[PDB]
Scaffold this motif. Structure first.
Motif, PDB file in Angstrom:
ATOM      1  N   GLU A  60      50.065   8.787 -46.904  1.00  0.00           N
ATOM      2  CA  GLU A  60      51.420   8.249 -46.849  1.00  0.00           C
ATOM      3  C   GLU A  60      52.297   8.858 -47.939  1.00  0.00           C
ATOM      4  O   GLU A  60      53.460   9.185 -47.701  1.00  0.00           O
ATOM      5  CB  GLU A  60      51.397   6.728 -47.019  1.00  0.00           C
ATOM      6  CG  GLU A  60      50.685   6.080 -45.826  1.00  0.00           C
ATOM      7  CD  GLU A  60      50.713   4.550 -45.918  1.00  0.00           C
ATOM      8  OE1 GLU A  60      50.393   3.921 -44.923  1.00  0.00           O
ATOM      9  OE2 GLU A  60      51.035   4.020 -46.972  1.00  0.00           O
ATOM     10  N   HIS A  61      51.732   9.011 -49.131  1.00  0.00           N
ATOM     11  CA  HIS A  61      52.500   9.490 -50.276  1.00  0.00           C
ATOM     12  C   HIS A  61      52.800  10.984 -50.182  1.00  0.00           C
ATOM     13  O   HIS A  61      53.922  11.415 -50.450  1.00  0.00           O
ATOM     14  CB  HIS A  61      51.736   9.209 -51.570  1.00  0.00           C
ATOM     15  CG  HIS A  61      51.609   7.744 -51.887  1.00  0.00           C
ATOM     16  ND1 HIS A  61      50.682   7.263 -52.797  1.00  0.00           N
ATOM     17  CD2 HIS A  61      52.285   6.642 -51.424  1.00  0.00           C
ATOM     18  CE1 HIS A  61      50.824   5.927 -52.854  1.00  0.00           C
ATOM     19  NE2 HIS A  61      51.788   5.495 -52.037  1.00  0.00           N
ATOM     20  N   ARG A  62      51.797  11.774 -49.804  1.00  0.00           N
ATOM     21  CA  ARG A  62      51.918  13.228 -49.886  1.00  0.00           C
ATOM     22  C   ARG A  62      52.394  13.832 -48.557  1.00  0.00           C
ATOM     23  O   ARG A  62      53.579  14.127 -48.404  1.00  0.00           O
ATOM     24  CB  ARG A  62      50.575  13.845 -50.316  1.00  0.00           C
ATOM     25  CG  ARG A  62      50.078  13.205 -51.618  1.00  0.00           C
ATOM     26  CD  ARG A  62      51.010  13.565 -52.776  1.00  0.00           C
ATOM     27  NE  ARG A  62      50.472  13.033 -54.030  1.00  0.00           N
ATOM     28  CZ  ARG A  62      51.203  12.885 -55.146  1.00  0.00           C
ATOM     29  NH1 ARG A  62      52.464  13.237 -55.207  1.00  0.00           N
ATOM     30  NH2 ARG A  62      50.638  12.378 -56.207  1.00  0.00           N
ATOM     31  N   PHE A  63      51.485  14.014 -47.600  1.00  0.00           N
ATOM     32  CA  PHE A  63      51.832  14.666 -46.339  1.00  0.00           C
ATOM     33  C   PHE A  63      52.789  13.821 -45.501  1.00  0.00           C
ATOM     34  O   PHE A  63      53.642  14.357 -44.792  1.00  0.00           O
ATOM     35  CB  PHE A  63      50.562  14.947 -45.537  1.00  0.00           C
ATOM     36  CG  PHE A  63      49.652  15.950 -46.202  1.00  0.00           C
ATOM     37  CD1 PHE A  63      48.562  15.511 -46.964  1.00  0.00           C
ATOM     38  CD2 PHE A  63      49.902  17.321 -46.061  1.00  0.00           C
ATOM     39  CE1 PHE A  63      47.722  16.443 -47.584  1.00  0.00           C
ATOM     40  CE2 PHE A  63      49.060  18.252 -46.681  1.00  0.00           C
ATOM     41  CZ  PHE A  63      47.969  17.813 -47.441  1.00  0.00           C
ATOM     42  N   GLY A  64      52.643  12.504 -45.581  1.00  0.00           N
ATOM     43  CA  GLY A  64      53.448  11.599 -44.763  1.00  0.00           C
ATOM     44  C   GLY A  64      52.864  11.415 -43.359  1.00  0.00           C
ATOM     45  O   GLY A  64      53.596  11.110 -42.418  1.00  0.00           O
ATOM     46  N   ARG A  65      51.549  11.594 -43.214  1.00  0.00           N
ATOM     47  CA  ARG A  65      50.890  11.404 -41.925  1.00  0.00           C
ATOM     48  C   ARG A  65      49.738  10.414 -42.058  1.00  0.00           C
ATOM     49  O   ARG A  65      48.616  10.798 -42.389  1.00  0.00           O
ATOM     50  CB  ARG A  65      50.334  12.733 -41.412  1.00  0.00           C
ATOM     51  CG  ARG A  65      51.460  13.753 -41.221  1.00  0.00           C
ATOM     52  CD  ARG A  65      52.403  13.291 -40.106  1.00  0.00           C
ATOM     53  NE  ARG A  65      53.341  14.366 -39.771  1.00  0.00           N
ATOM     54  CZ  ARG A  65      52.966  15.504 -39.162  1.00  0.00           C
ATOM     55  NH1 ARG A  65      51.724  15.727 -38.799  1.00  0.00           N
ATOM     56  NH2 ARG A  65      53.868  16.414 -38.913  1.00  0.00           N
ATOM     57  N   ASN A  66      50.015   9.139 -41.797  1.00  0.00           N
ATOM     58  CA  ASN A  66      48.977   8.111 -41.845  1.00  0.00           C
ATOM     59  C   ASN A  66      48.768   7.503 -40.462  1.00  0.00           C
ATOM     60  O   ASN A  66      49.698   6.963 -39.861  1.00  0.00           O
ATOM     61  CB  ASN A  66      49.364   7.017 -42.844  1.00  0.00           C
ATOM     62  CG  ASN A  66      48.119   6.266 -43.320  1.00  0.00           C
ATOM     63  OD1 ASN A  66      46.992   6.734 -43.145  1.00  0.00           O
ATOM     64  ND2 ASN A  66      48.259   5.119 -43.922  1.00  0.00           N
ATOM     65  N   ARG A  67      47.539   7.598 -39.966  1.00  0.00           N
ATOM     66  CA  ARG A  67      47.218   7.116 -38.626  1.00  0.00           C
ATOM     67  C   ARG A  67      47.509   5.624 -38.476  1.00  0.00           C
ATOM     68  O   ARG A  67      47.927   5.176 -37.408  1.00  0.00           O
ATOM     69  CB  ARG A  67      45.741   7.381 -38.319  1.00  0.00           C
ATOM     70  CG  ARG A  67      45.480   8.889 -38.335  1.00  0.00           C
ATOM     71  CD  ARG A  67      44.026   9.166 -37.945  1.00  0.00           C
ATOM     72  NE  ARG A  67      43.707  10.581 -38.153  1.00  0.00           N
ATOM     73  CZ  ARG A  67      42.561  11.150 -37.752  1.00  0.00           C
ATOM     74  NH1 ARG A  67      41.618  10.471 -37.142  1.00  0.00           N
ATOM     75  NH2 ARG A  67      42.376  12.421 -37.978  1.00  0.00           N
TER      76      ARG A  67
END
Length: 117
Positions: A60-67
């Motif tokens: 969530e913090h870095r790439f912005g891709r959380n399932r």
């Protein structure tokens, strides 16, 4: 130098390797009734969980891709703890057999899978 994979992928791969040790430990837990081995198992899962939970936090913090959201991840963690805690009781229990030990562990794996992906 061999090609390198993205940090998100690199973490995913190693987590799979961690599971094998748990699977191997599960066989040992079935093979032996000593709680001393279990003591490490309970802690070992925490490392796996912490890595997955921490990995989830980074997504969530870095790439912005959380399932999935944090709340769903936490729900799974609480269930895992109970299984290991219940297994400890079985080891302390006067009566116990190999199949009882493994059956408890088999479901622990399932909880770890759905957090892995």
């Amino acid at each position: 130098e061999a090609a390198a994979a993205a940090r998100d992928e690199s973490a995913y791969l190693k987590l799979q390797e961690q599971m094998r040790k748990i699977d191997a430990d599960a066989a040992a837990l079935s093979e032996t009734r000593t709680i001393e081995e279990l003591d490490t198992f309970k802690l070992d899962v925490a490392d796996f969980v912490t890595t997955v939970v921490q990995l989830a936090e980074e997504l969530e913090h870095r790439f912005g891709r959380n399932r999935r959201g944090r709340t769903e991840i936490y729900k799974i963690v609480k269930e895992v703890d109970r299984k290991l805690l219940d297994l400890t009781d079985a080891v302390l229990a006067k009566e116990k057999k190999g199949e009882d030990i493994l059956n408890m562990v088999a479901e622990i794996k399932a909880l770890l899978i759905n957090i892995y992906k």
